[PDB]
Amino acid sequence: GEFGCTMEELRSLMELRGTEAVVKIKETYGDTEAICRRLKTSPVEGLPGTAPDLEKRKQIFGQNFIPPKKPKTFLQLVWEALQDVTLIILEIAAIISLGLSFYHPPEAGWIEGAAILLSVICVVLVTAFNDWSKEKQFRGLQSFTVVRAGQVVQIPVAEIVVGDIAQIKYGDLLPADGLFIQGNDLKIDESSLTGESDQVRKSVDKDPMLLSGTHVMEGSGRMVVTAVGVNSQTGIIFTLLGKSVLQGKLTKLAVQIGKAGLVMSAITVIILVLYFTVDTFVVNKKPWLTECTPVYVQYFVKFFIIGVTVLVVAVPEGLPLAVTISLAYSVKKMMKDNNLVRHLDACETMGNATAICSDKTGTLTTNRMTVVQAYVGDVHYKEIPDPSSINAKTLELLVNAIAINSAYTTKILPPEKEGALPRQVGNKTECGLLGFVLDLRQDYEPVRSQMPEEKLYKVYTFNSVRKSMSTVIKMPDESFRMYSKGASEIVLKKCCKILSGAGEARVFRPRDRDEMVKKVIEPMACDGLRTICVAYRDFPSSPEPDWDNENDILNELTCICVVGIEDPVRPEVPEAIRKCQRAGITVRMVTGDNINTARAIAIKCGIIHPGEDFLCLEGKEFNRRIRNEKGEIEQERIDKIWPKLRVLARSSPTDKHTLVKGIIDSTHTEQRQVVAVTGDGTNDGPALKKADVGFAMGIAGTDVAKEASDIILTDDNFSSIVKAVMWGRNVYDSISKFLQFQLTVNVVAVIVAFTGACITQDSPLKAVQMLWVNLIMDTFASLALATEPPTETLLLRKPYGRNKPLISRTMMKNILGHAVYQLTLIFTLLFVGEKMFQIDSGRNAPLHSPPSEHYTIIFNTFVMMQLFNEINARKIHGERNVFDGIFRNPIFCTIVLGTFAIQIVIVQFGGKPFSCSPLQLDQWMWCIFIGLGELVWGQVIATIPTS
Amino acid sequence: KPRIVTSEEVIIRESLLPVTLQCNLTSSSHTLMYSYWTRNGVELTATRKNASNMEYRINKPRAEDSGEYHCVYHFVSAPKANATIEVKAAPDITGHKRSENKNEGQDAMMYCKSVGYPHPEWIWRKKENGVFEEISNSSGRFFITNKENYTELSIVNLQITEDPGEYECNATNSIGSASVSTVLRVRSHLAPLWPFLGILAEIIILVVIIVVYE
Ligand SMILES: *[C@@H]1O[C@H](CO)[C@@H](O)[C@H](O)[C@H]1NC(C)=O
Ligand SMILES: *[C@@H]1O[C@H](CO)[C@@H](O)[C@H](O)[C@H]1NC(C)=O
Ligand SMILES: *[C@@H]1O[C@H](CO)[C@@H](O)[C@H](O)[C@H]1NC(C)=O
Ligand SMILES: *[C@@H]1O[C@H](CO)[C@@H](O)[C@H](O)[C@H]1NC(C)=O
Ligand SMILES: *[C@@H]1O[C@H](CO)[C@@H](O)[C@H](O)[C@H]1NC(C)=O
Ligand SMILES: *[C@@H]1O[C@H](CO)[C@@H](O)[C@H](O)[C@H]1NC(C)=O
Ligand code: BEF
Ligand SMILES: [Mg+2]
């Protein structure tokens, strides 16, 4: 009826690897050869002819082409930036003000609405442009044979269909998933997909699982394609992929401020209505039958308009622009620490992170097999020594043995791309010895060049029973030289003598000499190392022994060198983890590798300490314990594991996603958690999307891991995650400094407006003056407080949390204390100010009079107190010295002096448009005196203990 | 000579009743060309018609309307006959100066304007104690330059000891009188010094609290 449908769903050999693969293959189907007979293909000359109908019928499996994502246009980014909780409300207020400005039932309003709309447009444009530029910067950084009809021919990748019989050689990149037919000991590297650092051996029975995106490192074979399109293991994860923590706090603060402003407006309207009702209805006692119909409703509408006017004053309009410019500046500064931030809203999250989940292979380790410690000449060096430590011909012998024994196809080349680690194209474990030789500052190339393959006499190859590959030649002299390297015990059992010391080759005694070498080798394997030893043999010149005889040639070996091979930790990782743990962060490792290697690297990195206080699990037993008898992920079961879990080994991407989700969603702890995830591989794709912050390695990371992440480490340095913590705690401070300065302007302004509308009939602070104070001057004030350099003492506090309010208790104390002083001074200048200054009182004006000197003094004093409060707003804790580190920031001084000069110009030459009258010299020094009294009042406020 | 019979003089009081002024050309043997009303030598707008008998009506009579009116008669080949209807009202001070703030040793000027005919005589009286006494020229620094309406008082080389006070400007005509007051302020030369001594008296406080606390 229907041909065999997509493999990943109908015969799910994929996603189930290991020895269990053939377990299902044998019971369901034949011997991986009848599976080809099930399809319209054969292991030999399969897919007999092109037959476009057949090709299109097979293309129902897939296209072998994943469409790239479509970059978003600037207008699309603007449209996305428009839809905000705060920005919608501000536009509503602006439109209300503009509409009610023109209501004159048979200047003001034209100013507030335009200012609000301009600030909103600036916010939208800045955010959209920054996202566009960052994404455009990111896009720049990132980046075969088949048996068609009898004769093998090169074919484009996109035309590969299910059933193709492909010939794969060393150095190739697998285009699609498939099964294994036949080959000669294929060894492949699946570190980017599976996470396993060890090279996997693909055989017909042990594990015939071929995955797309893995690099075949040695061997050649024949495969049949099974998963072509997005149905491959990489494509599934790719298709599975597609508000910040700070924005929630900002919107909660916004709604609280809005409710406060609404209460103030309601109070003023009630006061006005009660005054009218009491005055008119009691004394005059109007008939209240028909005369009130127009007059009373027009009066009530006027009072409602006055209340709406008071409501707008309370709302802070420069807050979004200040936050946006502070975030943009911090992102630009962070980019110089090799952190590429993409959305401009992720620059703050890492400051308050409480946990980190880290991949092992590629993230904490270098993913390169290197020799770390070596035992040569009865001297054991825990670190690689200098080239002339022993300075004997034994080093020349070692270099020659390594170069000639193996180095035919395995070579080490320069990266050919500036800013990357050296690249290897051969067997990874073999080039560890070549790396040892190169790091001994000796060149293996001359030794390899002088001996071509024709001149090699005999080359015994590593196989199942031999297990120790060897190379024996004769050219350099009349005698024979044989070199053999391999496993520690396997080759040690065949070492009759040992080249000991810098002198003469001694003999190897299994009774007494073996004890010392065992005592040297056992701690090596104890520390997770793999021990490989090298030996040499000589054959008599006359006669020539039978080389086919493997009995004598295998034995009688002189051991020369013993090395320790490992996948080492990155040099900066231990101290970076040590610094993050002091800042209140908990580091956990999630890896797809084994449990022993994971535990060893966790001990070296410092994640866990001996004692087994914490717990380490595997992928299978974590799934079984996390599920109830029904078979559903229960949040109550996860809360028993994640508090104490430190190492998770052999974990699928689904396991990492489940762990991160369980940590984020749990409410078992005292404080809610913020989780960041670091990675470099495709199996980290899901976990990097669920996390609040995702860090991706830049040079080593794959495309899937780099796309799903928010921050990219452009030099894959683990110590640049610590600078993401300290730049995220500096962002949160520079935003709480601006809240302290801005929220004391709004209280004073709203109370002055309420008093001038209710009690008096005009306010000393006009419309354009407050436009200058709130729009232009406060934006530059927020630009000044953002540029305070960070310091390494930020990394001593604990993370705050998701639900901690922005306005702390000290900030409340500062706001109230400064508002009290400002209000007292303003009211004293308003009501008794003309007797002190000996001028004409300008309290009541006929609206057809020039600006008064009584009111310009109040405006100037208000601006001066704001200017001198920009200095007190630098210490959000109880610090007494507000001048500490003032000169480290020249932008602050420049902005303050520029604001003072512009205020002088505005007052002197403003005129009627600014409602300002020129002032004398003695009348200006009193304004500076009253403004400078703010600093002296700051100390009186700071004396009061907030506890 | 043509004969013109004019209405009686009218005194503008606070009543809102309109006032009409009349001239009747009872005898004229010349061919009349046109006629018009004039106030203080200035022709009133839209008063030129045939008007063998012309009327001018004031709907809201005020002190600014009062003046020396004429109804001029221009003939084809005869000299003009003007006549006179005088409208008298009490003086009403239109503009003045609320206050004059000046520093020591400069010139201070204060002015008052009035309207209405007859043109009032001006008396300046400084408020000495609780009464308005006339100012004294006992130092040669007071200049009173009074014109038909404008009246200016100038003081040279202002002294803080005596000059500051209130100065009253009086306008009196046959009917009524009105007055306004102006306050003159003389500022000391060392005025900017006192705030300066207070600015650095709190800088010392700031650099003692911080440095003791270290
Ligand atoms: C007004 O018209 C009459 C009748 O024609 C004439 O006698 C008299 O001169 C005119 N007066 C003018 C034009 O001023
Ligand atoms: C004055 O002129 C008016 C307007 O023509 C006339 O009604 C009135 O009778 C005249 N009076 C005399 C006394 O001639
Ligand atoms: C009319 O002429 C007389 C001649 O005595 C003169 O006094 C008077 O000012 C003139 N009127 C006008 C308005 O010019
Ligand atoms: C006051 O006396 C001076 C003497 O120089 C003179 O110039 C001035 O006009 C006098 N002022 C008055 C009002 O008489
Ligand atoms: C004062 O009188 C002059 C001259 O007649 C006149 O131009 C001016 O308008 C008058 N000022 C006022 C305020 O009436
Ligand atoms: C102005 O001068 C007159 C005449 O000397 C005097 O009676 C009067 O009190 C003064 N003030 C006013 C307001 O008329
Ligand atoms: F690459 Be990791 F070990 F999953
Ligand atoms: Mg990895």
Numbering used by the authors:
A (entry chain A): 22 to 127, 148 to 184, 192 to 290, 338 to 1042
B (entry chain B): 147 to 360
Show me the paper's own sentences about this structure:
Plasma membrane Ca2+-ATPases (PMCAs) have a crucial role in this process by extruding Ca2+ against a steep concentration gradient from the cytosol to the extracellular space. Native PMCAs form heterodimeric assemblies with the small transmembrane proteins neuroplastin (NPTN) and basigin (BASI). Here we present the structures of mouse PMCA2 in the presence and absence of its accessory subunit neuroplastin in eight different stages of its transport cycle. The structures revealed an overall classical P-type ATPase architecture with ten transmembrane helices characteristic of the P2 subgroup.
Upon ATP hydrolysis, PMCA2 undergoes major structural rearrangements in the cytoplasmic domains, causing the opening of the M-domain to the extracellular space. In turn, this triggers the release of ADP and Ca2+, and the binding of counter-protons, finally leading to the E2P state. Although the PtdIns(4,5)P2–N841 interaction is maintained throughout all E1 states, it is disrupted by the large movements that occur during the transition from the E1-Ca-ATP to the E2P state. There, the binding pocket is widened and N841 is reoriented and interacts with Q837 instead of PtdIns(4,5)P2, explaining the profoundly weaker binding of PtdIns(4,5)P2 in the E2 states. During transition into the E2P state, M872 rotates away from the PtdIns(4,5)P2-binding site, thus allowing N841 to change its position and to interact with Q837. In addition to the newly formed interaction with N841, Q837 in the E2P state maintains its interaction with D873, a residue that is directly involved in ion coordination in the Ca2+-bound E1 states, but is displaced from the Ca2+-binding site. The displacement of the D873–Q837 diad results in a change in the calculated pKa of D873 (from approximately 6.0 to approximately 7.0), which decreases the affinity of the residue for Ca2+ binding and increases its affinity for protons. The transition to the dephosphorylation intermediate E2.Pi exhibits relatively minor movements, mainly pertaining to the closure of the ion-release pathway of the M-domain.
